[PDB]
């Protein structure tokens, strides 16, 4: 809509109070002129067809338990523009200022949330297993790096590369879930997930296992299931980012931690210059050595480290 920028108030999903960009036409819709070609949120009403309306409000305040899910999707988005853009020097996910567009009140008791090619997409779930998953900040984070990662790598989803598509996503969305500062962990979807459970989540990046996933390449998954398990074997993917960036000994080899900012450095690296469609496990290995290599130097602690990290899980 063309109209006049301004700022409204509102609360997401866990009830926190936040501010959010809108535009003033008439009506008060949420859309963000302040990041790129623009941040759309649409109100899919229940039903699947997308995306639905554009976010109209009466009056610029969000605090109607209808409005949370809308609130969290349009602001966290924001907040993952401006980790690409601060960090990365990226503007949005294909590199030119692309409009980010979200719709929420999918479908009845929808337990998930996607990329779709063209959009994000966010259920309420069902009360039990998920509350409205745009609540997660590492979530909102997760399905835009799938944006990033079909702009770029463009890796095919099943198998080991569809594996390495959905670790990139787990990864950026933990570091942005740091960089936001929002009660930072290497879990997923803790926020959103099993109301009435305290201290699980839906996957765990330090130890993958927790919840039967796998963390070294003799434990992967070989069946069809899942796209050939690419939201299992991403738990190999996930330990070994885990153990560049905070260090350990896993499975008897011992791995020197480097830091978040660097365990991002390098992968954005291998996302945007060296993994391609088809790429496995032993080419992302590859790729990130490659990346550390030319950041850091073939003979610095980073690259060591990113070594011993696969090492450790098993990719050679
Ligand atoms: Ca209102
Ligand atoms: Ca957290
Ligand atoms: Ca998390
Ligand atoms: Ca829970
Ligand atoms: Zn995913």
Redesign the pocket.
């Known amino acids: 809509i063309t109209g006049t920028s301004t700022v409204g108030v509102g609360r997401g999903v866990l009830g926190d109070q936040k501010n959010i960009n809108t535009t003033y036409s008439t009506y008060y819709y949420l859309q963000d002129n302040t990041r790129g070609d623009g941040i759309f949120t649409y109100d899919a009403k229940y039903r699947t067809t997308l995306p639905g309306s554009l976010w109209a409000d009466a009056d610029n305040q969000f605090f109607a338990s209808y409005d949370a899910p809308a609130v969290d999707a349009h602001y966290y988005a924001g907040v993952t523009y401006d980790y690409y853009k601060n960090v990365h020097n990226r503007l949005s996910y294909d590199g030119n200022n692309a409009a980010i567009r979200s719709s929420v009140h999918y479908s009845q008791g929808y337990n998930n949330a996607f990329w779709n090619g063209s959009e994000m997409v966010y259920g309420d779930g069902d009360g039990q297993t998920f509350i409205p998953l745009s609540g997660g900040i590492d979530v909102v984070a997760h399905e835009l790096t799938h944006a990033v990662t079909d702009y770029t790598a463009g890796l095919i989803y099943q198998n080991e590369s569809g594996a390495i598509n959905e670790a990139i996503s787990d990864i950026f969305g933990t570091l942005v ?1 740091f960089y936001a500062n ?4 290497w879990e997923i979807g ?2 959103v997930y099993t109301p009435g459970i305290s201290g699980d989540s839906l996957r765990s990046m330090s130890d993958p296992a927790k919840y039967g996933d796998p963390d070294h390449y003799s434990k992967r998954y070989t069946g069809t299931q899942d796209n050939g398990g690419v939201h299992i074997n991403s738990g190999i993917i996930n330990k070994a980012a885990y153990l560049i960036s905070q260090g350990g000994t896993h499975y008897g080899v011992s791995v020197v931690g480097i830091g978040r900012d660097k365990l991002g450095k390098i992968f954005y690296r291998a996302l945007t210059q060296y993994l391609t469609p088809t790429s496995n496990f032993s080419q992302l290995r590859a790729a990130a050595v490659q990346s550390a290599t030319d950041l850091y130097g073939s003979t610095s602690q980073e690259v060591a480290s990113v070594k011993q990290a696969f090492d450790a899980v098993g990719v050679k």
């Open positions: 879930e929002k009660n930072p962990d803790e926020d």
